[PDB]
Amino acid sequence: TMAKVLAVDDSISIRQMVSHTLQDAGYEVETAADGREALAKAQKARFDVIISDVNMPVMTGFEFVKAVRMQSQYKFTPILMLTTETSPEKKQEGKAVGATGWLVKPFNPETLLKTLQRVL
């Protein structure tokens, strides 16, 4: 079809980069600036994958994924979290609340594309 993506980051450049890169790759992309706006969008549709920054406004990315995992329709949905941390020990919180995998910032298009590809 064209996998449906919800990307959440308060950074304008991050949203534009993700949106442009994924859309050029055949994805249907929807962006949000914070956890509140993201949750509201996720609640109203059915995204195939969610990409979310850990340092989101309104709530941490951890609380966001946790709230997302609380909705039955998103129990198995792959979630990819953006972080500046390369150290696994530093974000065990991610696996705990239900994150599927990570994407370390700063990344590039190929990193983004391959990483997404590998969690679907």
Author numbering: -1, 1 to 119
Please quote the authors directly.
Vibrio cholerae contains multiple copies of chemotaxis response regulator (VcCheY1–VcCheY4) whose functions are elusive yet. Autophosphorylated CheA then donates phosphate to the response regulator CheY. Phosphorylated CheY interacts with the flagellar motor protein FliM and influence the direction of flagellar rotation from counter clock wise (CCW) to clock wise (CW). As expected, both VcCheY3 and VcCheY4 possess (β/α)5 fold typical of the response regulators.
